[PDB]
C-alpha cells in the first residue's frame, strides 16, 4: 500500500525467480507471453543476468544461441523453441529451414540478425567466473575454447557481409535487426517500402497485448512482412540481398555496439591467448566501426545519424541512437562534450517532466514522440543498462552510477516491464521481460 | 577466492533461483537429489520462502500438500511426485494406497506424519499478502476460505488421535515423525525395537550421499523398516496402532510446535472471522500442549524431556529439543531464565569451539555428539529459523536478531546445505536444500 | 533533484554526524538552537543512538544526566549547559539552585521531570556492549555498578512521590512532564489554570521556530510559566505540591512507560545480580502501573484515559496516548484486539490521507487535530520508535517491523526533524533533533 | 565475539562519527593524538569524506587549507592548529613564520609540500553537490568562484617551480613530500644525506605509537630533520634549494597524481566556464606529466622508476609507486598489460599470504619488505582508494570494484587505521585516522 516498492534483496530474489521461471531447459524465453522464444540480444542479456546465479547456466544460454548460428556466421535474431507457436511471423513464415543454404540443422531460426552485444555477455561471465574459484573458471574457459571461433565468425560475418564497402557501418535489411523495430529512425525508410500482394497473415502479438497505444500499427506489419518475402525470393543469399531489398539502412547504434563488442572480444582474446590474427582483426574492426560511427556525426552536437542506403540520405531523428558515439568513443573532445550536453539537457535526460533521470527512447520534444509507444518515447531498462555499462568503460564512473541508481529505482516495482512511460513511470508493454530482470540482477551486485 | 561469501542481494537471488529450480510445477522437492519429493514440514518452509516471491505460488504449495491430507485429518510426511523414483522407502514399500482406508485418492503418500509448522507458514503468507494490496490479499483470503477446515482437521487429528489421553503431548510411532530421525532422543526407544524378518530392501539414500559419517547406519534402517511393517499389518488404523507399535514416544518438541501452531491458527481465525467454536478449540489445544510441554521439564534447568510410552521412562538427552518450552511459553519465570542460561552457555550456543553463535542439534559436550552426523551435533538452518521466529514471538527481539544474523552469516556461502559442521562451518549432507533457501529468503527480507 | 532521499549508509552516516555535532563534550543538546541543553528523555534516546557508535560515550551521556538527579531521586527534565542561553525559561526563571533543597550541587536543572525511558536506553547499551567484546562489556557493567542505585532511586521517587495513593498511575504537575506539552490531552486541565501576578517574559522558542502554526500560543505559555510560580512558592517541596498546584493530572502514557521501564530494569537487575529486594520492588511497580493503566481503559475499545486529579474526571481525547496499554500489556485479550483495531484503522495509522503508515500524535478526524501544531497531529519519530520497540517486546514482530520501515522511509530525507506533517510529510519544528538521529541509527542497525 | 565486524550502516555511522570528532571547527586533524593538525593530502581525503555529510563543511575544509597557501602557490603539507602541541617538528622547528618570505600571514605551516589530490576532492564535492539540489550546488559553485585562482596557482607552482627543466616529473626536496616518508624508494637518496651540526630534539611521534616496528628509526629522523636545516638556511627560497638540498628526487607517483589532477581540474574548468587559458594550461600539464611518468618506465614490465636528481640515477625499487602509470595512462597497450599483470600477480595483490586482495606498499617478496613498518609493506586504505578511483576513471570498472570491495572488508573492523599488516590484517599505526574514515564513507555511498 504505502510503499509498493521492493527492497534490494526482495527485488534480486524476484528477478532471479523470474529468470528461472522463463527457462525452458536450455534457452530462456524473452518473455513468457509476448515473446515465448529465444531472441538474440535478449539472450546475451539473459546470460549476464544468469552469471551471478550460475556460470554454468549462463554459458548454456550462449551455447544454445551459438548452436543456432548460420553457416556463414550470422547469429539469427530468433531461435524458435521446440514446437512453441503463439508468435508470428513463425518458422513457417520465415521458411529458412528449406530456403537458406546457411540455415542451421535441427534449430528453427529467423532469417535476420540483431545487435552483437554477445561479447559483452562473455566479458561479464568471465568477470563473475574469476570471482568464484577454479572449477567455475574452468567452465568459463572451456566455453571460450568451444566458442571463440564461432564468436569470431559472428564478428567476421558482420564486418565482411554487412559492411561490404568497408565503410565501418552495419547495413540492415529490416528494422527488426536494429532491435528498435518501430523507432522513428526508420519511418522514412519504411515509407519507401511499397509491397505487392503478400501471403495472408493473422497478427499474433496484438492478441496478447491489448493496448494499441503500446504496440505498432497494421500498416507497419504489412511492410515488415513484404521485406521477408524479398529475402525469401533470393533464398537469404548475402550476395543477392543488395540487389533486391527495399529496405537498406546503415544503423549507427548497431555499429557503435559492434565497435565496442570488437574491442571487448579483442581484450578477451589477449587475456586468454587466442590466435594473434584474430585479436588483430578484432582491433581493426573496433577502430573501423568507431571511425564509421564518428563519420555520421553532426559537427556541432556530435549526434550520430543513421543512413538510408537506397535514398542516399542521412536519417536525422531525435532518438537515443544519436548517442551511439558515446558508447564506442572516437569523437573529438569538444564534440563529445557537446553530445554529453545534449544527453543531459532538456531534450533527453534533463527534460523537466521525466520521472527518472533516464534516457527516453525518443526525445519528448520531438514531433515523433509518443509516450506509450515502444521505442517512440518510453524508457527501456535494457538501454539504461547498456549506456551505463558503456559509460563505466569510458571512465565516466559517476554518470554510469546515476543511470544505474535511477534504473534500480524505476525497476523497484518488480514488474520487470520491457519499457516504462517516461513521465508517470507506469510499466508498459510486456511484463516479465527476461532482460529487465537481467539488468536488475547485474546492477544489484 | 579471498571472500567466497555472497552479498545479501546475490544470496537472495541464488536462494530464489534454487527454489524455482526445485519446483516440479505444483510441488517443490525438499532437495533435488536426496529428497526428490514433497516433505511435509519442508513444504511449509518452502511456502514461507515463496511468500516474498509469489503469494499465489506459496498458496499452491500448501494447496498441494493439503490435497494429500488423509480422510482422518493427518498430513502425511511425504507426498510422492508423479512417477519420481530414486527414494526409498517408496510408495510401494509404504503401500498406503491399498492398505489405508484414510489414504487420499490420486496422491501417493507415506503413512506417517511430521511436525505441524503449517499454521506458521500460513501466518507468513498472510503477512506478506497484507503488504501487497487488494488482489494479493484476495488470493491469501481465498486460500483461508478453501483450507481453513482442512487445517482444523489437521490440528484436530493431532489433538484427538495422537494425544488420546489428553496429556498435552503428541505420541509418535516412528522417529521419522519427529523430523529428527537419527537424534540421540530416540536411541533408547529404537534399542527396544527388535524386528522379525522384514521384506528385502536396497537402501537408496546412501547411494547419492557418499560419506557414511554424515548419514545413518544400516542397523537403523532395519528397525526403521520394521515399524513400517507393524503399521501395515493393522492397515494404519489409528485405533489399532497403540496395540501393536514397538515405538511409541511423546515428542516434546513436536508438542511445543503444535502449541505454537494452535495459538497462531487461533489468532488467524479471530482476524478472519472463522467459526468461534474452531478458535476456542485452537486456544484450548494451545494451552493443553503448552501445559503438556511444561510437565516434562526438569525443575532446576527447565530442560524438556521426551517420554517413551512403552518403557514408561523420561528420555533424558542433551539435544536442542530440550528447549521446546522456549517456543511455546508457559514455564515459571525462574525456570525459564534457567533454560535460557543453558541455551546460551557452554553446552550449547556458548560452546567455545563453535564457529557461529547458533544452536547445535546435540550439545558438543554430550556423549552422543557426532560433529558430522545429521541431528547428532550439526547446526541446521531450519532449526535456527524456527527458534528465531518463535523467540521474536516471545518478545525476545535481540535473541531472535542474533540467531538471524548468525544464520545469515553461516548461509552466505550459498551452498544451501541442510546442516553445517558446528566447529568448522563446513556445509554437510544434501546441498540445494529447499528449506535452507527458504529460511535465507525469509530472513533477508 | 529526482530523488531527494539518502541511501541507508548515507542516512546512518548523517545521523551519526549530527549526534556528534550536538555533543558539547559530556552532554548532547536536544537540538542546536531551539533546545541547546540536555533534555531528560531526549538524553535517553541520545544514549540509544550513541550505543552503536561508542558504548563509552553512551554511558557518559547517562552519567551526566544522573549526576543532575535530585537528592530525592527525581531526574529533572532539563540539565542546563554551563553558560548557555537562548532557551527560556532558563536557570534563573526556575530558581531551583536557590529554592529547591533537593536540587543537585554541581549542576543547573529544571524543577520538573519527564518520562522514564532511561531503563530502555540501559538495555540497548547492554545489548550493544554484549556484542562488542570484553573491554566494552566491562564499560557497561561498571556503569551498572556505579548507577544502579541511582536508577532505583529514580524509579522509587516516581513510585512513592508521584503515586502517593498507590493507584498505579503517575501524577504530573506540569504538562511539560508528559513530554507532550500542547497535547489536547491537557486542554481542559489547562483551562482551569488561572495565572495570577505573573512576572513579565519574552519567549525565545518562537524566535527560532517563527512559523506560529508549529509552536504553542502565547496564552498557553502564560499558563506554563504560572505553574512554575506555584512550584517555586513552595520551594519545589513534594509534600506541598498537592495542596498548591493548579495542574494535577495522572498521565497514563507516562504510567505505561514506567511499567515497561520497571520490567526492563528488573530484568537487567536479575541478569547482572543486583540486590534481590530491588528486583522485587521493580516487578511490583511494573505490575502496579500495568494495572493502573488498564483501570483507565474504555470498555469497548480499550483506549486509555488520563485522569484530572483536581476535577476528579476522566480525560477523553483522541491522541496517541490512548494506546498506552499496548506498550505495557494487561488488557483482556478481546479489548486489546479492539485497541489494535483502533490504532490500525481510519482514525489513526490507516487514515487514507497519511503519507506514511505511522501514528499521528492526534487523530486526523478529531476536532482537536491540527496538521502542523506540535503534538496536536504531527507524526513524531520518537513515538514511532517507542511503539515499535515496545511492540517487538510484546512479540508483535511484524507490527514493529512495519513501523520501523515507515519511520525509516519518512526519515530518509535527512532533516532529522522532531515531527512531520502527517499528510505531506513536510518536516516541521526544529531540524537537527538528536533523538530523531538516534531513532534512525537504532533502526538501521 | 563471533564476528567483530560492523554492518555497512554501522560502519558508515562510525566513520562519520570519527570525522566529526576530529573536527576542530574549521579544520580536521589527521589523527587525534599522532597527527593533531591539518595535513594537506589528508585534508583532501577529509573533504571527500565530508561531501556526503555536508557539502558546506567539505568546502570549509578546503577553504582552510587554501587559506594557508604560500604567496608563490605552494600548498604546505601541515597547517598547524592554533596553540596545539604534541607533534614534532612543530611550528618553531620549521620557523617558516619568520624565515619564509612566501609563508601565509594568518596561519602557521610547514615549509614543504605534499601530493596534489586536491582537484579530485573538488570533483567529488561537485558530484555530491549536483545530486543535492539548488542551494547546495550554489555552495559548491561559490567555492569554485572563490578558489579556482588558488587551485591554478597551486598547480602552476608545481609545474614551474618543481619541474624547472620541463621534464614532466615533480622534484621533491624531502621524502615527507611524497607522502611515503620511509618508503624504500628513498633509501639510497637518504644514504647520501649527511647531517651536520644538527640541533638537539626529542621525537613525539613514537611516544604515541610506541611499538618501534611501526614507525621510522632514530637514524631516519636525524636525516629528516637535517633537511629542514638546509631549507631554513636559504629561507625556503625556491631558487636556492637546487644549490643546497642534499635530497633531490623526482617522484613518479606524485607526478602521475599531478597528471590526473590537472586533467580533472581542466574538466572542471570547462564545465564551470573558467578562463580558457587556464584550462589550456591544465591540459598541457596533464599531458606533460603523463609523458614524464611514461619516460621512467621499465621496457619489459612498464614499472615506473623514481629519479635521483643529484646522483643522476634511476631508483629501482619494488613499491606501489611502480604502478604510477596506471593512474595517469600513457603506456603503450602491451606494456600496460604487463604492468597490470605485475600488480595482480604474486609480487603484489596476488601474493598467496595476503589477507586481502589489496596492494601492499612494498612487495612481500622484496628484500626491503617489512610487514609492520609504515610504507615498507603494510596495506594503506588511502592507496586502495586512489587506485580504485583512478582505475574507475580508466574505465576498469571491475578492477576498481574489486579494490573497493576488499578495502571495505579490511576496514569493516572499524579501527580506521592508516595501514594494516598485509598477512594478518592487524590494524597498525594510529587508529582513528580521518582519511581512512573518509575512504570508507566515499566507498559505501
Ligand atoms: O523482433 C520482434 O518481433 C519484437 O522485438 C521486440 O522484442 C524482442 C524480444 O524482447 C527484443 O529483442 C526487441 O528489442 C524488441 O523490440
Ligand atoms: O524422512 C526422511 O526420510 C529424511 O528426513 C530428513 O529429510 C527430510 C526432507 O528434507 C526432512 O523433512 C527431515 O527433517 C530430515 O531429517
Ligand atoms: O520541554 C520543553 O520546553 C519543550 O518540549 C519539547 O522539546 C523537548 C526536547 O526535544 C522534548 O523532550 C519534548 O517532548 C518536546 O515536547
Ligand atoms: O608527514 C609526516 O610527518 C607523517 O606522515 C604520515 O602522516 C600523514 C598524516 O596522516 C600522512 O599524510 C603521510 O602520508 C604519512 O606518511
DSSP-assigned letters across all residues of D36-87: -SEEHHHHHHHHHHHTTT-HHHHHHHHHHHHTT--TTS---SEEPPTT--S-
Give bridge partners of residue B172 from the DSSP assignment: B249
Q: Provide residues with CB under 6 Å of ligand 4.
A: D 30, 35, 39, 41-42, 176, 179, 181
Contact criterion met (CB below 8 Å) for B381 and B407: yes
- Enumerate residues 6+ apart whose C-beta is below 8 A from A229: A195, A196, A198, A199
Specify the resolution in Å. 2.1
- Tell whether the torsion through CA atoms of C78, C84, C86 and C89 is positive or negative: positive
Task: Kindly identify which residue of chain D lies nearest to residue B7, measuring between CA atoms.
Answer: D405
**How big is chain D by its Cα radius of gyration, in Å?**
20
Q: Which of D2, D9, D58 to mutate to test the interface with C (most CBs of C within 10 A)?
A: D9
Every domain of chain A and the residues it spans: 1-445
| B356 interaction partners in chain D (CB closer than 8 Å) | 2
Task: Kindly identify which residue of chain B lies nearest to residue A14, measuring between CA atoms.
Answer: B53
φ, ψ for residue D313, nearest 5 deg: -140, 140
From C370's Cα to the closest Cα of chain B, the distance in A is 29
| C355 interaction partners in chain A (CB closer than 8 Å) | 2
- 3-state class (DSSP) for residue B195: coil
* D61 vs D48: CA distance, rounded Å: 10
- Tell whether the torsion through CA atoms of C244, C249, C254 and C256 is positive or negative: positive
**CB-CB: which of B131, B270, B392 is closest to C337?**
B270
From C374's Cα to the closest Cα of chain D, the distance in A is 28
Q: What is the dihedral of CA B398, B399, B404, B406, to 10 degrees?
A: 110
Which ligand lies nearest the alpha carbon of D430? 4
**CB-CB: which of C131, C389, C395 is closest to B393?**
C395
| C3 interaction partners in chain A (CB closer than 8 Å) | 406, 409
Interface contact flag, C409 A3, Cβ < 8 Å: yes
Contact criterion met (CB below 8 Å) for C11 and C414: yes
* B400 vs C199: CA distance, rounded Å: 56
Residues counted in chain B: 445
What are the grid coordinates assigned to A2, written together? 504505502
Q: Could you give the C-alpha distances from C334 to B267, C299, C320, in angstroms and in order?
A: 11, 10, 20
* C179 vs C168: CA distance, rounded Å: 19
Q: Could you give the C-alpha distances from B22 to A405, B15, B16, B17, B38, in angstroms and in order?
A: 32, 11, 10, 9, 10
* A9 vs D404: CA distance, rounded Å: 21
Element of type H or E holding C39: strand C38-39
* D114 vs B67: CA distance, rounded Å: 76
Contact criterion met (CB below 8 Å) for C342 and C301: yes
- Enumerate residues 6+ apart whose C-beta is below 8 A from B369: B360, B362, B363, B376, B377
Contact criterion met (CB below 8 Å) for B76 and B70: yes
* B209 vs B429: CA distance, rounded Å: 7
CA angle B219, B220, B222 (to 5 degrees): 65
Q: Residue holding cell 561537485?
A: D126
**CATH 1.50.10.10 for the B1-445 domain, yes or no:** yes
What are the grid coordinates assigned to A367, written together? 514531433
* B74 vs A261: CA distance, rounded Å: 60
Q: What is the DSSP letter of D445?
A: -
CA D158 to ligand 4 centroid distance, Å? 20
What are the grid coordinates assigned to C356, written together? 506514511
Contact criterion met (CB below 8 Å) for B439 and B382: yes
Ligand 3 within 6 A of CB of C307: no
Interface contact flag, B357 D1, Cβ < 8 Å: yes
* A242 vs B166: CA distance, rounded Å: 89
- Enumerate residues 6+ apart whose C-beta is below 8 A from D364: D347, D351, D353, D354, D371, D377, D422, D423
From A110's Cα to the closest Cα of chain C, the distance in A is 42
* A81 vs A31: CA distance, rounded Å: 13
* B8 vs C25: CA distance, rounded Å: 38
**Continuous H helices in A217-308:** 218-232, 241-244, 252-271, 276-295
From D268's Cα to the closest Cα of chain C, the distance in A is 21
Give the distance from CA C74 to its chain's centroid: 15
Long-range contacts of B136-143 (CB under 8 A, 24+ apart): B136/B55, B139/B55, B139/B56, B139/B59, B140/B55, B140/B59, B141/B272, B143/B59, B143/B62, B143/B63
Within 10 A of D445 (CB to CB), how many other CB atoms are there? 14
| Burial of B209 (C-beta count, 10 Å sphere; 0-12/13-18/19+) | middle
- 3-state class (DSSP) for residue A35: strand
CA C374 to ligand 3 centroid distance, Å? 10
Ligand 3 within 6 A of CB of C327: no
Contact criterion met (CB below 8 Å) for C102 and C74: yes
Task: Kindly identify which residue of chain B lies nearest to residue D349, measuring between CA atoms.
Answer: B2
Interface contact flag, C392 B394, Cβ < 8 Å: no
CA D179 to ligand 4 centroid distance, Å? 6
| C445 interaction partners in chain D (CB closer than 8 Å) | 7, 9-10
CA angle B160, B161, B165 (to 5 degrees): 70
Of D418, D433, D434, D438, the one to substitute when testing ligand 4's pocket (max ligand atoms within 8 A of C-beta) is: D418
Amino acid at each position: 500500500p504505502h510503499d509498493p516498492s521492493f527492497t534490494p534483496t526482495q527485488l534480486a530474489a524476484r528477478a532471479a525467480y523470474l529468470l528461472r521461471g522463463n527457462d525452458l531447459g536450455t534457452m530462456t524465453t524473452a518473455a513468457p507471453l509476448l515473446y515465448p522464444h529465444m531472441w538474440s540480444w535478449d539472450a546475451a542479456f539473459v546470460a549476464i543476468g544468469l552469471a551471478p546465479l550460475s556460470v554454468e547456466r549462463a554459458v548454456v544460454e550462449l551455447d544454445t544461441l551459438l548452436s543456432a548460428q548460420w553457416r556463414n556466421g550470422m547469429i539469427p535474431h530468433i531461435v524458435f523453441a521446440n514446437g512453441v507457436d503463439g508468435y508470428f511471423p513463425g518458422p513457417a513464415r520465415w521458411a529458412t529451414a528449406t530456403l537458406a543454404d546457411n540455415a542451421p540443422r535441427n534449430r528453427l531460426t529467423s532469417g535476420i540478425t540483431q545487435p552483437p552485444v554477445h561479447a559483452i555477455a562473455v566479458q561479464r561471465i568471465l568477470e563473475h567466473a574469476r570471482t568464484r574459484g577454479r572449477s567455475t573458471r574452468a567452465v568459463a574457459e572451456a566455453f571460450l575454447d568451444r566458442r571463440w571461433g564461432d564468436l569470431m565468425r559472428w564478428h567476421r560475418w558482420l564486418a565482411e557481409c554487412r559492411d561490404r564497402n568497408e565503410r565501418g557501418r552495419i547495413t540492415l535489411y529490416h528494422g527488426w535487426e536494429s532491435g528498435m523495430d518501430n523507432s522513428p529512425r526508420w519511418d522514412s525508410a519504411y515509407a519507401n517500402v511499397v509491397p505487392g500482394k503478400l501471403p495472408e497473415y493473422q497478427r499474433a502479438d496484438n492478441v496478447i497485448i491489448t493496448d494499441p497505444s503500446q504496440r505498432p500499427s497494421d500498416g507497419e506489419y504489412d511492410r515488415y512482412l513484404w521485406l521477408l518475402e524479398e529475402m525469401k525470393a533470393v533464398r537469404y543469399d548475402d550476395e543477392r540481398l543488395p540487389s533486391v531489398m527495399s529496405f537498406q539502412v546503415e544503423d549507427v547504434f548497431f555499429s557503435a555496439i559492434f565497435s565496442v563488442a570488437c574491442q571487448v572480444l579483442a581484450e578477451i582474446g589477449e587475456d586468454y591467448k587466442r590466435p594473434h590474427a584474430d585479436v588483430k582483426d578484432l582491433y581493426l574492426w573496433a577502430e573501423r566501426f568507431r571511425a564509421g560511427v564518428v563519420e555520421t556525426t553532426d559537427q556541432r552536437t556530435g549526434a550520430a545519424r543513421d543512413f538510408d542506403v537506397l535514398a542516399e540520405k542521412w536519417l536525422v531523428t531525435e532518438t537515443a541512437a544519436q548517442f551511439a558515439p558515446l558508447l564506442c568513443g572516437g569523437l573529438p573532445h569538444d564534440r563529445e562534450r557537446a553530445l554529453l550536453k545534449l544527453l543531459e539537457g532538456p531534450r533527453f535526460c534533463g527534460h523537466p517532466d521525466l520521472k527518472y533521470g533516464l534516457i527516453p527512447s525518443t526525445s519528448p520534444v520531438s514531433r515523433d514522440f509518443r509516450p506509450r509507444e515502444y521505442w517512440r518515447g518510453p524508457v527501456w531498462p535494457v538501454l539504461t543498462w547498456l549506456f551505463s555499462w558503456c559509460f563505466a568503460r569510458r571512465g565516466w564512473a559517476e554518470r554510469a552510477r546515476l543511470l544505474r541508481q535511477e534504473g534500480l529505482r524505476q525497476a523497484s516495482d518488480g514488474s520487470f516491464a520491457a519499457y516504462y512511460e517516461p513521465f508517470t513511470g507506469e510499466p508498459l508493454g510486456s511484463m516479465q521481460q527476461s532482460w529487465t530482470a537481467a539488468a536488475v540482477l547485474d546492477w544489484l551486485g
